Chain A
Amino acid sequence: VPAHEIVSGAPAELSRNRVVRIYQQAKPATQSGEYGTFAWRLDWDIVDVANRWENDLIGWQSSGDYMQATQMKFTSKESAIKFANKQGWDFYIQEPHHRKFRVKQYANNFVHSYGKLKHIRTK
């Protein structure tokens, strides 16, 4: 693995103190769309002193962390890993979580009760 962190122009502080995270974005519980859940995002863990603080004056969110808004998209997981250790970065990788396939029937809703009903559907 060639070490490109000396020829990128990035400081040594970023490659030696900052840990970064590769993750695939979760499907939102809000809406039924799944489009932003395919690319692998690369995202920096926050610094606890440098993350954000409110201003004296008006209360603007001021920051000294500069990688807080940078976020990368990759097609592949191995793309993100190859780029991340090619730039010499400490990374954690988060495995995705898909839904378990369960067979659904509409005729499931009204099957015959032999004993206690134990449920009342509505529709």
Chain B
Amino acid sequence: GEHALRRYPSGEERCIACKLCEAICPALAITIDAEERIDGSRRTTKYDIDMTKCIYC
């Protein structure tokens, strides 16, 4: 049904910005921009799904 970005136990965003969900999406619904944050950890600055062009594959 609808989409959700999960979190770890003890609250961490899980999205390591690997761009795989963007690379595979058959209808180009995902758009991501990614930057290294203050920790030096790799996270998404920007995550986005258009649910009008999502196809639920």
Which chain A residues have a beta carbon within 8 Å of chain B's beta carbons?
A: 58-60
Shortest Cβ gap from B33 to chain A (Å): 8
Mark contacts of B25-54 with chain A using CB atoms, 8 A cut-off: 1 yes-contact digit, 0 otherwise.
000000100000000000000101000000
| Residues of chain B at the chain A interface (Cβ within 8 Å) | 31, 46, 48
Query: Shortest CB–CB separation between residue A53 and chain B, in angstroms?
Result: 15
Contacts of B46 in A (CB 8 A): 59
Q: Which residues of B contact A60 (CB under 8 A)?
A: 31
* Complex CA–CA separation, A51 to B48 (angstroms): 22
Chosen A-B contacts, 4 in total, with CB atoms closer than 8 Å, are A58-B31, A58-B48, A59-B46, A60-B31
Q: What's the nearest-Cβ distance from chain A to residue B39, in Å?
A: 24
Whole-angstrom CA separation of A112 from B46 in the bound complex? 59
User: In the complex, which residues of chain A have a beta carbon less than 8 angstroms from the beta carbon of B31?
Assistant: 58, 60
CA distance A59 to B46 in the complex (A): 10
Q: Which B residues are CB-close (under 8 A) to A58?
A: 31, 48
Which A residues are in CB contact (< 8 Å) with B48?
Answer: 58
A19 CA to B48 CA, complexed, in Å: 35
Residue of A nearest to B48 (CB): A58
In angstroms, how far is the closest chain A Cβ from the Cβ of B31? 7
Closest residue on chain A to residue B33 by CB atoms:
A59
Name the residue on A nearest B46 (C-beta). Answer: A59
Alpha-carbon gap, A58 to B31, bound state (A):
10
Interchain CA distance A46-B48 in the complex, whole Å: 27
B45 → A minimal CB distance (Å) = 10
